[PDB]
Structure 1
Amino acid sequence: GFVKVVKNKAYFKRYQVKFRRRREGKTDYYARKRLVIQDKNKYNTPKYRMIVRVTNRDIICQIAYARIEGDMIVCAAYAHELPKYGVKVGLTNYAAAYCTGLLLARRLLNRFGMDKIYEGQVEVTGDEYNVESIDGQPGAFTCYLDAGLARTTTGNKVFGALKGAVDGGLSIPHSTKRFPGYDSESKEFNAEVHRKHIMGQNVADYMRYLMEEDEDAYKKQFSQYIKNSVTPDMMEEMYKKAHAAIRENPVYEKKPKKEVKKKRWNRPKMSLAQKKDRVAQKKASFLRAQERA
Structure 2
Amino acid sequence: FVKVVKNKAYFKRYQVKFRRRREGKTDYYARKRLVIQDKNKYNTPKYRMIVRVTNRDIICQIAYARIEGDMIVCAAYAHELPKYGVKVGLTNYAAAYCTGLLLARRLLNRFGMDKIYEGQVEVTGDEYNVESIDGQPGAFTCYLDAGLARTTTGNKVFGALKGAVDGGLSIPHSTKRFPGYDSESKEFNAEVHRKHIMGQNVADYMRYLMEEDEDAYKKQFSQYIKNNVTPDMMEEMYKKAHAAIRENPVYEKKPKREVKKKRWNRPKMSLAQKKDRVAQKKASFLRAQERAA
SS of aligned partner of 2:69: coil
Q: What is the CA deviation profile of residues 13-61 of structure 1, one whole-angstrom value per residue up to 9, with x for unaligned ones?
A: 0000000000000000000000000000001100000000000000000
Does structure 1 residue 229 correspond to structure 2 residue 228? yes
Whether contact under 8 Å (2:128, 2:165) holds in the other structure is yes
Shift of 1:258: 1.8
Deviates more, 1:254-263 or 1:20-29: 254-263
C-alpha offsets along residues 239-258 of structure 1, whole Å, 9 cap, x if unaligned? 00000000000000000122
Residues in 2 aligned to 1:93 and 1:231: alpha-carbon distance in whole angstroms? 16
Q: What do residues 144-201 of structure 1 show as CA deviations (whole Å, max 9, x unaligned)?
A: 0000000000000000000000000000000100000100000000011000000000
CA contact (8 A) 2:94 2:196 kept: yes
Counterpart CA distance in 2 for 1:257 and 1:141 is: 32
- How many residues matched? 292
Matched residues in 1 for 2:32 and 2:279: separation?
Answer: 52
TM-score of the two chains, using structure 2 as the length reference: 0.99
Contact 2:180 2:191 in 1 (8 A): yes
Matched, 1:277 2:276: yes
CA distance in 2 between partners of 1:36 and 1:94 (Å)? 26
8 Å Cα contact 2:130/2:139 also seen in 1? yes
Q: Secondary structure at the match of 1:133?
A: coil
Shift of 1:259: 2.2
CA distance in structure 2 between the partners assigned to 1:283 and 1:68 by the alignment:
51
> Is 2:88–2:227's contact at 8 Å kept on the other side of the alignment?
no
Runs of 4+ in 1 over 3 A off after TM superposition: none
Distance (Å, rounded) in 2 between the aligned partners of 1:186 and 1:236: 29
2-structure distance, mates of 1:221, 1:228 = 14
- Aligned to 2:59, the other structure's residue is in SS state strand
In the TM superposition, what is the alpha-carbon distance from 1:11 to its structure 2 partner? Answer: 0.3
1:257 matched to 2:238 = no
Q: CA deviation at 1:85?
A: 1.5
**TM-score if structure 1 supplies the norm length?**
0.99
Cα deviations by residue, 1:259-287 (Å, 9 ceiling, x for unpaired):
21100001000000000000000000000
Secondary structure of the residue aligned to 2:10 is helix
Between the aligned partners of 2:232 and 2:127, the Cα distance in structure 1 is 26
| Distance in 2 (alpha carbons) for counterparts of 1:125 and 1:138 | 26
* Separation of aligned partners in 2, 1:3 and 1:51: 48
Contact kept, 8 Å, 2:158 with 2:177, in 1: the verdict is yes
Q: Alignment partner of 1:71: what SS?
A: strand
Report the alpha carbon displacement of residue 86 of structure 1 after superposing the two structures with TM.
Answer: 1.1
3-state SS in 2 of match to 1:22: helix
Question: Please, which runs of 5 or more residues in structure 2 have no aligned partner?
Answer: none
Aligned equivalent of 1:98: 97
Query: Any unmatched runs of 5+ in structure 1?
Result: none
DSSP-derived class of the 2:212 partner: coil
